[PDB]
From Swiss-Prot, chain A:
Protein name in UniProt: Elongin-C
Tissue specificity as recorded in UniProt: Overexpressed in prostate cancer cell line PC-3 and breast cancer cell line SK-BR-3.
Quaternary organization: Heterotrimer of an A (ELOA, ELOA2 or ELOA3P), ELOB and ELOC subunit. The elongin BC complex interacts with EPOP; leading to recruit the elongin BC complex to Polycomb group (PcG) target genes, thereby restricting excessive activity of the PRC2/EED-EZH2 complex. (Microbial infection) Interacts with HIV-1 Vif; forming an active cullin-5-RING E3 ubiquitin-protein ligase complex (ECS complex).
Disulfides per UniProt: none
Main location: nucleus
GO biological process: protein ubiquitination; regulation of transcription by RNA polymerase II; target-directed miRNA degradation; transcription initiation at RNA polymerase II promoter; ubiquitin-dependent protein catabolic process
Post-translational modification: Ubiquitinated by the DCX(AMBRA1) complex, leading to its degradation by the proteasome.
Role this protein plays: SIII, also known as elongin, is a general transcription elongation factor that increases the RNA polymerase II transcription elongation past template-encoded arresting sites. Subunit A is transcriptionally active and its transcription activity is strongly enhanced by binding to the dimeric complex of the SIII regulatory subunits B and C (elongin BC complex).
Source organism (scientific name): Homo sapiens
PANTHER family for the chain: ELONGIN-C
InterPro entries registered for this protein in UniProt: ELC1, SKP1-like, SKP1/BTB/POZ_sf, Skp1_comp_POZ
Swiss-Prot record, chain B:
Listed name of the protein: Bromodomain-containing protein 4
Native species: Homo sapiens
Note: JQ1, a thieno-triazolo-1,4-diazepine derivative, and I-BET, a benzodiazepine derivative, have been tested on tumors with success. Treatment with GSK1210151A (I-BET151, a I-BET derivative) has strong effets on mixed lineage leukemia and promotes myeloid differentiation and leukemia stem-cell depletion.
Intracellular or extracellular location(s): Nucleus; Chromosome
Post-translational modification: Phosphorylation by CK2 disrupt the intramolecular binding between the bromo domain 2 and the NPS region and promotes binding between the NPS and the BID regions, leading to activate the protein and promote binding to acetylated histones. In absence of phosphorylation, BRD4 does not localize to p53/TP53 target gene promoters, phosphorylation promoting recruitment to p53/TP53 target promoters.
Residues of the full protein shown: 44 to 168 of 1362
Gene: BRD4
UniProtKB/Swiss-Prot annotation, chain C:
Name used for this protein in its record: Elongin-B
Species of origin: Homo sapiens (Human)
Family: Belongs to the Elongin B family.
Residues recorded as bearing N-acetylmethionine in the entry: M1
Compartment(s): Nucleus
Protein's job: SIII, also known as elongin, is a general transcription elongation factor that increases the RNA polymerase II transcription elongation past template-encoded arresting sites. Subunit A is transcriptionally active and its transcription activity is strongly enhanced by binding to the dimeric complex of the SIII regulatory subunits B and C (elongin BC complex). Core component of multiple cullin-2 and cullin-5-RING E3 ubiquitin-protein ligase complexes (ECS complexes), which mediate the ubiquitination of target proteins. By binding to BC-box motifs it seems to link target recruitment subunits, like VHL and members of the SOCS box family, to Cullin/RBX1 modules that activate E2 ubiquitination enzymes. Component the von Hippel-Lindau ubiquitination complex CBC(VHL).
Gene: ELOB
Keyword set, alphabetical order: Acetylation, Host-virus interaction, Nucleus, Phosphoprotein, Transcription, Transcription regulation, Ubl conjugation pathway
From Swiss-Prot, chain D:
Effect recorded for N18T: In VHLD; type I
Annotated effect of mutating P94L: In VHLD; type II
Portion of the full-length sequence here: 61 to 207 of 213
Organism: Homo sapiens
Protein name: von Hippel-Lindau disease tumor suppressor
Phenotypic consequence of L124P: In VHLD; type I
Reported effect, L124R: In VHLD; type I
Record annotation: effect of changing V95M: In VHLD; with RCC
Gene: VHL
Domain notes: The Elongin BC complex binding domain is also known as BC-box with the consensus [APST]-L-x(3)-C-x(3)-[AILV].
Length: 91, 127, 104, 147
């Protein structure tokens, strides 16, 4: 089970399954060319990066499900920062 | 055929008129209803041949649709706003006559009518 | 079923899943694989409650219904510090700004 | 003409089932491939409807026009019934990209005339304004079908 460490601008570290972090085209690019298991985000704070990690978990659990799936919830207070992060991360 | 000709939209023997209320009925009321998700059944006369409704034009003596109303407004057919409003009411009433009270088409008509009543509630005074 | 977890210590968060039927000790093995400290150097918590190694996650009150992929349940982690264990200490995340007026 | 219903005149009973948290707008693509919306389904509801062999359906959020899935796919066409068994159409959320899901929530909170008062990179203004659009999704799907 390969894990990767995603580090927020404010120094929180998030350890997620590599396969889950590859939901992000940006992270995929950043880890491309082994021939690296740590990624620093200078402009994504911890409250946003935490929520992004929950999206990765949600995406891998429910993509290609044959049946119903729940709504990914986003509080109004985080929506703009999460939009910026999602745009940056290509996920 | 099963289908009568549609109602006339232009009649040289019928006095034509335009008022600011009839303008509002075209530019605001008809436009809003025309653009509604459920307008499509009401945008043209009921095609009783295609829909296989051999009794439609036996049950409905005064057919009316928003395509006819649109053309009547654009051709200044109506004497006043009341005449135009009567045509919208006839369109709704015909739907309610021909169809069962819980039918899909009746719910679509009721949605348009609710909106219609909200918009004519803001009809400008004649000026 | 599966339970979706966030295991938190200081400014470390592990996102992982496990089964209701898997044990607290088994979860410490997952932590060991990731942070390279053995189970005997770990205390796991649900809120302020120390979890027994032998209990299943279900017996600890984790459930599939309240530990969802999009809203994982938090497990507190404290590491041994020589002759003692550190106090459980989960550093808060940053805060969003005030909601903009145009968002009501 | 690519995405349109065939005029089979062969009846096919279908169950529409809304297993999304959205109000669903069923949309029939008629014989000229033009969208004809039908009565909405509240979340968790379903009903049995009369359609026809080779008729083409899609499903949207009735309030926002966000795209939905039916039996895991963007488009639904029924079969003939076997021994009069109804055909089932299970309507669900897709997994939206996080960016699209964020655009949904911001659009749900902010009037379009206020989009350009949010402090976000300018490119996100155009993204917010680019509302989900059945015509544009039909052009993209018709692209996909050519390939």
């Amino acid at each position: 089970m390969m894990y990767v460490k995603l580090i927020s601008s404010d120094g929180h570290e998030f350890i997620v399954k590599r396969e889950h972090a590859l939901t992000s085209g940006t992270i995929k690019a950043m880890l491309s060319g082994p021939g690296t298991n740590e990624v620093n985000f200078r402009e994504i704070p911890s409250h946003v990066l935490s929520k992004v990690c929950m999206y990765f978990t949600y995406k891998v659990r429910y993509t290609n499900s044959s049946t119903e799936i729940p709504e990914f919830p986003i509080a109004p207070e985080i929506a703009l920062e999460l939009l910026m992060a999602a745009n940056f991360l290509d996920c | 055929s099963m289908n009568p000709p549609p109602p006339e939209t232009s009649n040289p023997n019928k006095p034509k008129r335009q008022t600011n209320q009839l303008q509002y009925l075209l530019r605001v009321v008809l436009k809003t209803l025309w653009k509604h998700q459920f307008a499509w059944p009401f945008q043209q006369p009921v095609d009783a041949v295609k829909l296989n409704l051999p009794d439609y034009y036996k049950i409905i003596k005064t057919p009316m649709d928003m395509g006819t109303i649109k053309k009547r407004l654009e051709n200044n057919y109506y004497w006043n706003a009341q005449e135009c409003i009567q045509d919208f009411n006839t369109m709704f009433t015909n739907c309610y006559i021909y169809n069962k009270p819980g039918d899909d088409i009746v719910l679509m008509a009721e949605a348009l009518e609710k909106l219609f009543l909200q918009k004519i509630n803001e009809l400008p005074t004649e000026e | 079923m599966d339970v979706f977890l966030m295991i938190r210590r200081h400014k470390t968060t592990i996102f992982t899943d496990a089964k209701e039927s898997s044990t607290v000790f088994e979860l410490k093995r997952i932590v060991e694989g990731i942070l390279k400290r053995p189970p005997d150097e770990q205390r796991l918590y649900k809120d302020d409650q120390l979890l027994d190694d032998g209990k299943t996650l279900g017996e600890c009150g984790f459930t599939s219904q309240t530990a969802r992929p999009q809203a994982p349940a938090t497990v507190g982690l404290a590491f041994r510090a020589d002759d003692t264990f550190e106090a459980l200490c989960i550093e808060p995340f940053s805060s969003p700004p005030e909601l903009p007026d145009v968002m009501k | 003409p690519v995405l349109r219903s065939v005029n089979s005149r062969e009846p096919s009973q279908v169950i529409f089932c809304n297993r999304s948290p959205r109000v669903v707008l069923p949309v029939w693509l008629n014989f000229d491939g033009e969208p004809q919306p039908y009565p909405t389904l509240p979340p968790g509801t379903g009903r049995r409807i009369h359609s026809y062999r080779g008729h083409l359906w899609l499903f949207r959020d009735a309030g926002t026009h966000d795209g939905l899935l039916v039996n895991q796919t963007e488009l639904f066409v029924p079969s003939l019934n076997v021994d009069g068994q109804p055909i089932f159409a299970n309507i669900t959320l897709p997994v939206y990209t996080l960016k699209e899901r964020c655009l949904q929530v911001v659009r749900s909170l902010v009037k379009p005339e206020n989009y350009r008062r949010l402090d976000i990179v300018r490119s996100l203004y155009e993204d917010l304004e680019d509302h989900p659009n059945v015509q544009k999704d039909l052009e993209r799907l018709t692209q996909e079908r050519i390939a």
